[PDB]
Ligand binder design. Structure first.
Ligand code: HEM
Ligand code: HEM
Lengths: 735, 744
């Protein structure tokens, strides 16, 4: 009955094993913790400015929100032991009221997201092309807050779904907040913002039954796509492995729209923003990603948090595609068309700076959930263009943030606050934090000598002025004829893919269309694919039991994009960029592990910054051949192959795990998913479960012992991400 | 056959796209009962327009059509071009004067409302309740007074922990909330799928919820109790152990909302016309029986189909396989309040059916899906404080706090005090009072008076004295004697006897599943001392349970732990078979689904016999192959393919049938072999006809065969009776010792 009474006092273990070490530790070594407790020495101007709202807990009394000390937090106030609860229990009512009101509306789109703190630093001054203060000095450090997201799913949906990913960066500049709100693909599905609710309604769960969550694999999405060919380009990206990234650290970022850079002389240069991952480009395979939404719906959120806790800081290079004003009409596509990409072969990405994400938040709700990004948040030195999708976004973000964040003072929520000064004549509104002392709440005023005052535009610390673009035309609701091309960009993307990426696009479309109940929708989508590429259209049609007509086989292919048939920068894997730091290997233990193998495996993995998870049939410990006590991180079922990048089976008492269904399935799944597998000594007997002949094959590392050559072979395979050459062999594998 | 898109050019970016439906009318689902996957799913009023009740009929004034109507703004202005924003030139800036764009985007920008604090993930349906006989001797509740009185209902089933976008087949408690639209007011029976709750006093609700929910630093994990904070709370609060035992069992992973029980948990009161109070505990007994998934299948199913339960509920209703539940009452006279070892007011305690039987009171049928999920499901507001004359509360300290919570949360979730004016929430009976204003006030009051007592409207609306029928609400005059204290009743201070009773009531396979539930969850707890503290709690329940969990965690029990005296029996009972899902057979095959693995030259005689036998028992089938489209049988019969082997995995079916034909076509297909291996591992019945018996090799079954694997030269009478008998028993429990060697 002591559990139902005040107080329980000290409940922590005497050994202090409840507390995680405040130092970089590998994933699973320590319990995860709020950022300021895990890495207190990791700081920047924004993190430091948040100290005034940080609340501790240690050695403090439990109180009401009014500061009244609570004596009993286990019971309601009642008339007797077994009596009715009394209306006068203000402690119960305050505690329950706050609980009852915890939830706020989720984001209309990108509701599912994971965020981190970091910093940006430019390589050199960009004063020749932009007067933006954050890009003016190589020694200028700009704090950032980045949120990565899916699009369709709710805040409680799964991470490894097939979707476009959001990549939003809040720059806390000395001249205002700049939000770069992008996606992991260089194009969007639609051309004009007016269609945004139509497209979103089509991709989102269907209105009658609210199915499916985090999936475009349903009738309404494909109905919209079939009737709106402008969507075909982004659909091609979503159907590719781009739609299933391995991690937020292994995907690209793009602003999509052409914006303008404005220099001190007033010269405008067209710009498209890019984020290039230091970890390279890497994606999952469909079966692995779908099953991973089951085994770990928080996979990406977890991987992001744990990489930062390990010191494997996600790093991205900021890049600009720069086009002079006089080159506006030099391309086959309209620069203002967000369904069109600018090929890197035509306009190269100029590396401008680097962003490092080095600290997790303290409280997910207060920092991540309440963060408000808006592409309308630009600074002097930047400007918009007439892109009709960007134009509409400018209205949307401010409007949605009012209801989501409960009013017009959302900029006063700590995460959203600028670190630079902010002063104006705006007043009141729900939850007003700032107390204005200004005698005047209007301008022009004489009572406060007209302060705060306007600042003229200038080279630095000047007021914002829009680029004086010449506008000529009649007031029309009309799409520009220049935007009326829908097939060349999807064709360019398709031909830029490797044959194995092309197979994955075919399988992506085939799987999704098989989930469409109305067959005519499938047929209409296949007809659209025939206007892109006949090989793609035939391969999808075959998987759907659809036969193409003679007329469909005679469809003239769309033209090249300014002479380009393909661009290898559009492929995830064509150009190698694979880094092993931060990757994870499963190590399948047995009851009498050969310690020499394990010592060599771990030493080689550590040298490359590759993590390991020791797996067994149960938790606790196992004892090696030399007496070394090995702690078990998880079971074979607990941390499936889906969650790792490679599998290593060291030697020892193999008979212990040879007939274990879970051990054999672990290898079969990793095999099917094209993951590198390494087998030492008697572990080579597992080749039988994966149908591999005695002579072996590429992608299966094997030797008498785990040593120098063995580990170099496995790490080289890990640098290539997956064993693509294994694809013809997986179809026979029951996994 | 060969439908071509009507749009390939710039007409796609212009007004006047006009008729886009296929000429064959294949876009429209049949407005008649159809099996799952046969037709596209549709809003309820379009799928079943002839299915009606008093509540569904009352919603007609707010139903909005679409066919043959002009596209307009919310102000009724006809829109000419819904493809473009207004701009100064075709490549110019968007103009602030585009009121059409701004209205369309504003509405979109404001679509989301806060999800429910708990039970955010849920699926709902319309139906009706009807009592078997008048219960006037025990209650004056109008809805229970006449066997011919039909009460419309709205039911929402849910999980607890996860967000609105979380998965269905998680390990969690399930919510089972029923809104009764009675002639004397709305009565909400807001229950769960277990007879007890985790905690005793409502004051602890935010502590327990915060512990089970995603951890505050990183918001992980979703839809899972398999994390440090949950097990930390459980280890320090033994009152949680009873509901933990239920969550760790297969009760925590139901097969369908149709195959779970429902309970009000709290002891309430029934009040008759003479003023006599009878203590009552509410029960919902599923007509489809009790059935649950196995952990590996449930977890993988959150991946393959996170909408599995929502889908199964909608499709069963569209097929005419209406979810049916018997309302049951455990009745205890006032003088029997202290007759049990446990306190009746203790929500961590169940009333064993062996001590107090469940009396069948009526039946509830769910026969129509909503039209709009947001408007009807998302906006529905259930509250256990919504009682009617003939019902009353008790001093249960968890129920007492719930009375405050629901009204309070509904104000912010539903944007004000007029949430009862939201169509789904409206009573079908009259409602009149002196309450006024508030955000989005729909009702226009004509009463000259907004107060009482008043002479200006001759005191109308007026108070009604309590009585046998159509009387005012009066609380039972319960005697209250005690000092103002924040104190738990000593009678609630017992935490181990109910978890032990539950444990001993389980079959050995159910016990193995409880052990595996605890082992799997605790393996996910990072801090080892938490695992050890939970194992220590299990040792106070049952030593066999604690030892089995400890072994799976590499934990060794101390001599002191092995010497822990077991808790006492519950009023002489060591076990109650009503606590098991499977001890007493109750399995029905209607509404179950079978995967049929096709080949390129299927033996039509086998398929004709399979489908005829399945149809006779109301069992659905899904024809699967390596691709979509069609396959041609041996006699020339064209067979339509419902899904691929990967498209509709074995996780989504109750049994697998492989007919004969060209077996070589699928014999070396990895997906076809894995389908059978997964169904095998998951203890599902498997039937193999003719050359399909060659698949026994992939499931490591000897030539002589085994129980659970139906095999014959052809699919016929005996073959199908054997498979349907296996389906009636739900899973092949005898297969458990063989599954561990299976790589699946
Ligand atoms: C280039 C095309 C687009 C891109 C790259 C894009 C990207 C994003 C991203 C990354 C977020 C989430 C930021 C966060 O982490 O909180 C988001 C939020 C959102 N976007 Fe966009 N978006 C696009 C187009 C649109 C359009 C056309 C509209 C409407 C006219 C729109 C309306 C919204 C809204 C309302 C939100 C939720 C904002 C909030 O609640 O704070 N987006 N978008
Ligand atoms: C016997 C124990 C309990 C049971 C069976 C129970 C059951 C449920 C169910 C089924 C719902 C979802 C109704 C729906 O589908 O909308 C729910 C909602 C909720 N419950 Fe309870 N509950 C219990 C205890 C509590 C306690 C102790 C509190 C707070 C003191 C509480 C607060 C809530 C809240 C705030 C909601 C959301 C209601 C809304 O937003 O409409 N519940 N509960």
């Amino acid at each position: 009955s002591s559990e139902a009474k005040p107080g329980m006092d000290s409940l922590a273990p005497e050994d202090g094993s409840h507390r995680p070490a405040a130092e970089p530790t590998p994933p699973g070594a320590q319990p995860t913790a709020p950022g300021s407790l895990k890495a207190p020495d990791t700081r920047n101007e924004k993190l430091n400015s948040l100290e005034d709202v940080r609340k501790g807990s240690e050695n403090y009394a439990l109180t009401t929100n009014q500061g009244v000390r609570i004596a009993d937090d286990q019971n309601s106030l009642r008339a007797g032991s077994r009596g009715p609860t009394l209306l006068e229990d203000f402690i119960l009512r305050e505690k329950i009221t706050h609980f009852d009101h915890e939830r706020i509306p989720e984001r209309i789109v990108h509701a599912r997201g994971s965020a981190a703190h970091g910093y940006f630093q430019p390589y050199k001054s960009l004063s020749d092309i932009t007067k933006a203060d954050f890009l003016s000095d190589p020694n200028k450090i700009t704090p950032v807050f980045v949120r990565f997201s899916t699009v369709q799913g709710g805040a409680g949906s799964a991470d490894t779904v097939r979707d476009i990913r959001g990549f939003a960066t809040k720059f806390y500049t000395e001249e205002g907040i700049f939000d770069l709100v992008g996606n992991n693909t260089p194009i969007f599905f639609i051309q004009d913002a007016h269609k945004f609710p139509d497209f979103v309604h089509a991709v989102k769960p269907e209105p009658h039954w609210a199915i499916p969550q985090g999936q475009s694999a349903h009738d309404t999405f494909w109905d919209y796509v079939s009737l709106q060919p402008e969507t075909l380009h982004n659909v091609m990206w979503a159907m590719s492995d781009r739609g299933i990234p391995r991690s937020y650290r292994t995907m690209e970022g793009f602003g999509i729209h052409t914006f303008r850079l404005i220099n001190a002389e007033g010269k405008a240069t067209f710009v498209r923003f890019h984020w290039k991952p230091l970890a390279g480009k890497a994606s999952l395979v469909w079966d692995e990603a779908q099953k991973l939404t089951g085994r770990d719906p928080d996979f990406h959120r977890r991987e992001l948090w744990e990489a930062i806790e390990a010191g494997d800081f996600p790093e991205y290079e900021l890049g600009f595609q720069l086009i002079p004003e006089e080159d506006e009409f030099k391309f086959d596509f309209d620069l203002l068309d967000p369904t069109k990409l600018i090929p890197e072969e035509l306009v190269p990405v100029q590396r401008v700076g680097k962003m490092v994400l080095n600290r997790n938040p303290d409280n997910f709700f207060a920092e991540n959930e309440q963060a408000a990004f808006h592409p309308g948040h630009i600074v002097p030195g930047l400007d918009f263009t007439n892109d009709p999708l960007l134009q509409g976004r400018l209205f949307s973000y401010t409007d949605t943030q009012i209801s989501r964040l409960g009013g017009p003072n959302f900029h006063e929520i700590p995460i959203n606050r600028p670190t630079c000064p902010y002063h104006n004549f705006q007043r009141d509104g729900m939850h007003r934090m700032g107390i204005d002392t200004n005698p005047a709440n209007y301008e022009p005023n004489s009572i406060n000598d007209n302060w705060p005052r306007e600042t003229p535009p200038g080279p630095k610390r000047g007021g914002f002025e829009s680029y004086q673009e010449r506008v000529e035309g009649n007031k029309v609701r009309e799409r520009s004829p220049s935007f009326g091309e829908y097939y060349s960009h999807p064709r360019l993307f398709w031909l830029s893919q490797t044959p194995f990426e092309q197979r994955h696009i075919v399988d992506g479309f085939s799987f999704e269309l098989s989930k469409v109940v109305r067959p005519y929708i499938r047929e209409r989508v296949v007809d659209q694919l025939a206007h892109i590429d006949l090989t793609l259209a035939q391969a999808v049609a075959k998987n759907l039991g659809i036969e193409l007509t003679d007329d469909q086989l005679n469809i003239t292919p769309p033209p090249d994009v300014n002479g380009l048939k393909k661009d290898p920068s559009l492929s995830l894997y064509a150009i190698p960029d694979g880094d092993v730091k931060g990757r994870v290997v499963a190590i399948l233990l047995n009851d009498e592990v050969r310690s020499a193998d394990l010592l060599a495996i771990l030493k080689a993995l550590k040298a490359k910054g590759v993590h390991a998870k020791l797996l067994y049939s149960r938790m606790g410990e196992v004892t090696a051949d030399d007496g070394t006590v090995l702690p078990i991180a998880a079971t074979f079922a607990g941390a499936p192959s889906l969650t790792v990048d490679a599998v290593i089976v060291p030697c020892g008492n193999i008979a212990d795990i040879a007939d274990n269904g879970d051990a054999n399935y672990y290898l079969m799944e990793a095999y099917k998913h094209l993951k590198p597998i390494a087998l030492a000594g008697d572990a080579r007997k597992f080749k039988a479960t994966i149908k591999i002949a005695d002579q072996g094959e590429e992608g299966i590392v094997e030797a008498d012992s785990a040593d120098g050559s063995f580990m170099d072979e496995l790490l080289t395979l890990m640098a290539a991400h997956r064993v693509w050459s294994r694809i013809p062999k997986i179809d026979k594998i029951p996994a």
